[PDB]
Amino acid sequence: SEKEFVEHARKAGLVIPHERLERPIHLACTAGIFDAYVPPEGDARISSLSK
Amino acid sequence: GADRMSKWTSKRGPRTFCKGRGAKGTGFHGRDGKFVQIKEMIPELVVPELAGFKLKPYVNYRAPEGTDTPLTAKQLFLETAAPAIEKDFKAGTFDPEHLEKYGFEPTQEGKLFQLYPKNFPR
């Protein structure tokens, strides 16, 4: 007479489980392009001639 | 009906059921019905002087530990009585009958802190 439902999908991560990982994350890349290239304003009229 | 798994504490009975929670008694009942507290029954905390104490609750992390060698009766005897016995036997004055001069207590009923009856809490 007192059976209940289960499986309430929730995502709640705290700083303690986010910092209590024994082994660290072994990344294969970086977050972004450090020292991002800034192309010069004039490229459309310089791509016409090769030299 | 009433519960059976729950603990039978002093909160679960009538007024006439006043059960202690485990604290040791500290006196008796006097003449006119009051409670007479005995000073000797109250524990006296023997707290030392920590003003000049050069030790801290934690040890240095680089300090080495040692191999676990729990102290045994054999080691205690070797440390406290074996040199004296050896020296006295070499001198030739050793008396097997009398051992009270070496720390041996034939009867514990004389001293204050007895070992087998355990007259002291801690």
Binding site: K11, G13, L14, P17, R20, E22, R23, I25, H26, L27, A28, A31 | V46, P48, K54, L55, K56, P57, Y58, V59, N60, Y61, R62, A63, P64, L76, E79, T80, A81, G103, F104, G110, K111, L112, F113, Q114, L115, P117, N119, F120
Partner: protein, 206 residues
């Protein structure tokens, strides 16, 4: 303190008392038991921090450093070799930080490699004449040094600074014990000069 676990417990590379493990397996679950090959502590030759090679998988023949070992499921994991990609930053309307996590591997799939020729070998335990038990390779016939690995605390003894509540090494290692036949109580009473003349009466025990 230690946590208690039901006998029907499955190990998933997560701390048993961790929130992720709790959400994966609630306290009321009991899953099917997986067969685990019994390997004793005296025969477990795969430690943490040593270089190993991969036998089967997508990264066949690749070598990596062991970062964790789980004795309950006979699992050994290497950093960034056998990897599947997962998203860790999940929100209602934003995603990112897709990192490659790595799956565990078995002792039958991971074997130790000696640092001399960097070729796969079979490890057998041997007793040296010096009283030490060091792993000895059989393919080549050389000993493999113990792979010293940093502990999970994160502090190395070489660089440590004492705080206000830490004893100095000399004070901690100073020996002041005089092994006499007096109790701690008697010695403290004598040291502090507490004089007690009267003695206890007769007490019956039964």
């Amino acid at each position: 303190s230690k946590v208690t676990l039901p006998p029907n417990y499955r190990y998933g590379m997560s701390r048993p008392g961790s929130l992720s493990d709790k959400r994966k397996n609630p306290p009321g679950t009991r899953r099917r038991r997986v067969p685990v090959e019994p390997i004793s502590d005296e025969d477990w030759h795969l430690f943490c921090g040593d270089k190993v090679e991969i036998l089967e998988g997508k990264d066949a023949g690749k070598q990596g450093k062991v970062v964790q070992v789980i004795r309950q499921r006979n699992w050994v994991v290497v950093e960034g070799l056998n990897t599947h990609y997962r998203y860790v930053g999940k929100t209602v309307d934003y995603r990112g930080t897709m990192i490659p996590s790595e799956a565990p591997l078995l002792h039958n799939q991971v074997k130790l490699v000696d640092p001399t020729d960097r070729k796969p070998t079979d490890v057998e335990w041997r007793f040296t004449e010096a009283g030490e038990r060091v792993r000895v390779s059989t393919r080549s016939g050389r000993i493999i040094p113990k792979p010293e690995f940093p502990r999970a605390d994160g502090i190395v003894p070489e660089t440590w600074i004492d705080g206000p509540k830490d004893t100095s090494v000399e004070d901690a290692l100073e020996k002041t014990y005089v092994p006499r036949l007096k109790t701690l109580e008697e010695e403290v009473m004598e040291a502090m000069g507490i004089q007690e003349t009267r003695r206890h009466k007769k007490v019956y025990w039964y």
